[PDB]
Amino acid sequence: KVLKIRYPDDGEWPGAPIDKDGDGNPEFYIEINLWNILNATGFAEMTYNLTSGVLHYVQQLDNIVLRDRSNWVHGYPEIFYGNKPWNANYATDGPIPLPSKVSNLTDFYLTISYKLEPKNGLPINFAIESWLTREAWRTTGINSDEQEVMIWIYYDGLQPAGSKVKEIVVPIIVNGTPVNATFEVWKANIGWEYVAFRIKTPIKEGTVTIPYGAFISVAANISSLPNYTELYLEDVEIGTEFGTPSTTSAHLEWWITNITLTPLDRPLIS
Ligand SMILES: [Ca+2]
Numbered sequence: 001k002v003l004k005i006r007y008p009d010d011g012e013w014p015g016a017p018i019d020k021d022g023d024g025n026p027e028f029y030i031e032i033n034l035w036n037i038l039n040a041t042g043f044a045e046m047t048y049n050l051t052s053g054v055l056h057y058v059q060q061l062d063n064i065v066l067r068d069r070s071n072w073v074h075g076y077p078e079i080f081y082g083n084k085p086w087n088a089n090y091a092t093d094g095p096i097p098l099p100s101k102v103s104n105l106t107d108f109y110l111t112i113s114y115k116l117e118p119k120n121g122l123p124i125n126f127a128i129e130s131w132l133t134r135e136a137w138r139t140t141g142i143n144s145d146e147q148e149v150m151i152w153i154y155y156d157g158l159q160p161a162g163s164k165v166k167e168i169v170v171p172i173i174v175n176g177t178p179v180n181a182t183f184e185v186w187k188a189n190i191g192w193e194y195v196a197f198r199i200k201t202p203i204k205e206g207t208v209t210i211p212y213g214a215f216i217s218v219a220a221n222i223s224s225l226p227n228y229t230e231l232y233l234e235d236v237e238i239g240t241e242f243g244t245p246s247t248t249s250a251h252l253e254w255w256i257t258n259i260t261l262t263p264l265d266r267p268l269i270s
Helices: 212-222
Strands: 002-007 015-018 028-031 037-049 054-066 078-083 106-118 124-133 147-156 163-174 177-189 193-199 205-211 235-239 250-267
Touching: 002 015, 002 028, 078 250, 106 124, 106 147, 106 212, 147 205, 147 212, 163 212, 177 212, 193 212, 205 212, 212 250, 235 250
Parallel strands: 147 193
Antiparallel strands: 002 037, 015 028, 028 078, 037 054, 054 250, 078 235, 106 205, 106 250, 124 147, 124 235, 163 177, 163 205, 177 193
16 A cells, blocks of 8 residues: 655665556656765655555755766656666556657646655755657667756756756646746757756646647757657656755655646647
């Protein structure tokens, strides 16, 4: 009834599938993913109650030393659907067939219900991301002719990599009300092409629906990559990047109660 993963008890890379029907194909996959922490005191723990579908993350880290300061953030505790291309973890029990080529995929709404509670001014975002790869089922990382796309619906004290390109409007739904929101578009080259959409009005808690293709279409349009529409949208990851090279203590709690992907009858890219 309750799935729990914990750092450092379960090792430096705790993770587990959510597979409510026990059929061997996870609906989602969770990782604590403190990918840039070399050492810290304290703990991080993620629990999923299968019996309510609440995911609850609790982190209390101190004495943090990073693997590589140039990577800026400390980690990205997360839940994801599809194939995460950095490792052998996946979740494909859902209505959207990921991975799929972007030229073949339908648009979809992504709806998330959540609440964030960073403590003491910790820099954080709440960021949705996808990786776009040349192969269908990548498990060994990311090359220079591929893309990372992020959508930050909350932030405090973090800036995306690279430089600001533009602002766009995206129709979204916030707490049941359709609203026109503005996102800054940022682009970087960090070993691969990075495009981030940072909302200008951060949303710290509630229920938010976004149309995924509004973001992928812009990321395609601004891309310097050849043959963009032949890339595969590998996954949809949801989590909180946190920390900066100056941050030595990072206390954070958050909850996600629902993630739903809803197919639309229209192409992803327009
Ligand atoms: Ca399953």
